[PDB]
Scaffold this active site. Sequence first.
Site, PDB file in Angstrom:
ATOM      1  N   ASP A 137       0.838  -1.201   0.000  1.00 33.90           N
ATOM      2  CA  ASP A 137       0.000   0.000   0.000  1.00 33.90           C
ATOM      3  C   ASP A 137       0.864   1.239   0.000  1.00 33.90           C
ATOM      4  O   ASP A 137       0.582   2.224   0.688  1.00 33.90           O
ATOM      5  CB  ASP A 137      -0.990  -0.009   1.167  1.00 33.90           C
ATOM      6  CG  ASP A 137      -2.154   0.967   0.980  1.00 33.90           C
ATOM      7  OD1 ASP A 137      -2.446   1.331  -0.166  1.00 33.90           O
ATOM      8  OD2 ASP A 137      -2.774   1.370   1.995  1.00 33.90           O
ATOM      9  N   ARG A 141      -0.253   9.083   0.618  1.00 38.20           N
ATOM     10  CA  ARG A 141      -1.084   9.205   1.812  1.00 38.20           C
ATOM     11  C   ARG A 141      -0.603   8.332   2.960  1.00 38.20           C
ATOM     12  O   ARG A 141      -1.082   8.500   4.095  1.00 38.20           O
ATOM     13  CB  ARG A 141      -2.518   8.826   1.443  1.00 38.20           C
ATOM     14  CG  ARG A 141      -2.677   7.414   0.964  1.00 38.20           C
ATOM     15  CD  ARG A 141      -4.078   7.108   0.430  1.00 38.20           C
ATOM     16  NE  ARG A 141      -3.976   6.196  -0.712  1.00 38.20           N
ATOM     17  CZ  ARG A 141      -3.750   4.886  -0.617  1.00 38.20           C
ATOM     18  NH1 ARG A 141      -3.609   4.324   0.580  1.00 38.20           N
ATOM     19  NH2 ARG A 141      -3.650   4.131  -1.731  1.00 38.20           N
ATOM     20  N   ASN A 142       0.299   7.389   2.686  1.00 36.73           N
ATOM     21  CA  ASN A 142       0.913   6.550   3.722  1.00 36.73           C
ATOM     22  C   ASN A 142       2.325   6.955   4.079  1.00 36.73           C
ATOM     23  O   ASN A 142       3.005   6.206   4.810  1.00 36.73           O
ATOM     24  CB  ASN A 142       0.852   5.071   3.343  1.00 36.73           C
ATOM     25  CG  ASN A 142      -0.558   4.543   3.436  1.00 36.73           C
ATOM     26  OD1 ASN A 142      -1.327   4.999   4.294  1.00 36.73           O
ATOM     27  ND2 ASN A 142      -0.935   3.619   2.561  1.00 36.73           N
ATOM     28  N   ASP A 155       1.916   2.745   7.828  1.00 34.66           N
ATOM     29  CA  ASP A 155       0.813   1.856   7.446  1.00 34.66           C
ATOM     30  C   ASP A 155       1.259   0.418   7.314  1.00 34.66           C
ATOM     31  O   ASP A 155       1.441  -0.081   6.204  1.00 34.66           O
ATOM     32  CB  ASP A 155       0.056   2.327   6.198  1.00 34.66           C
ATOM     33  CG  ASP A 155      -1.191   1.504   5.945  1.00 34.66           C
ATOM     34  OD1 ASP A 155      -1.620   1.382   4.784  1.00 34.66           O
ATOM     35  OD2 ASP A 155      -1.719   0.941   6.924  1.00 34.66           O
TER      36      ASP A 155
END
Length: 274
Positions: A137, A141-142, A155
């Site tokens: 992932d 945004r992580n 994350d």
Amino acid sequence: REFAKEIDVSYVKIEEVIGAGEFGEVCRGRLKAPGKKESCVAIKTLKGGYTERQRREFLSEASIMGQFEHPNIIRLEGVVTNSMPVMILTEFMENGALDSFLRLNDGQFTVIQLVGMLRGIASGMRYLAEMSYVHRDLAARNILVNSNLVCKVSDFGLSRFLEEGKIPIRWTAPEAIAFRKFTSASDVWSYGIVMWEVMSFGERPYWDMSNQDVINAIEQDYRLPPPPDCPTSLHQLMLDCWQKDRNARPRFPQIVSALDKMIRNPASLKIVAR
Ligand SMILES: Cn1ncc2c(N)nc(-c3cccnc3)nc21
């Protein structure tokens, strides 16, 4: 079951709520342990009524994060599991998620600063790949950002996607979408997407294309174009990350080396398209 960084809840002062996470609030707080100076932490809490499955899923992130130690990987500062509410404490990252931080600061950091951010992310991923950890992932945004603009991978979790949350199509390599084969080379594809997100100051990959449209376009040789003002050498590195043949993609050590060369030879970043 037992966590190496279990910590007395009286060592934690929860201050303001600073975010919303998958399982509850994220707060800023202070951690003050005997014999240690007070430090700022981010605190994830698991509150209210939750299944045992959710509790294990929530705490699995601490289990995984605690296996790592690297300046570009979010540091676990402790957990509270012997009492309620359950808590995960990490180092505090004053600038939050990279994608929203860059949107707030559109055009306001230089290319060399952006390359430094990408180098830190790549170094974190170089470490995870060496640890045989596949992130699955990897997305802006992580990535979390501290006051000094140091970027750190966050994350963590080993749970399978629903198909095996859902596979994050826009960040995922085509062989991982098609065959569920996630490797560090699929992580490299995602890293190329992150490069595009960074150089575009947090624009959404593929804009308004649907997930199926993205899958089809990639299969039909489409690749995201250079962001405005993006040095061609950085776009070419993105294209290298986005080779269909996973074995042709650069590995993370190569990626870090390429970024380090740009930092040493900044004149190589002046060439831009059009
Ligand atoms: C601002 N900051 N500093 C550390 C940190 C973290 N581990 N996680 C989060 C976080 C995680 C999930 C949703 N919103 C915020 N934020 C953090």
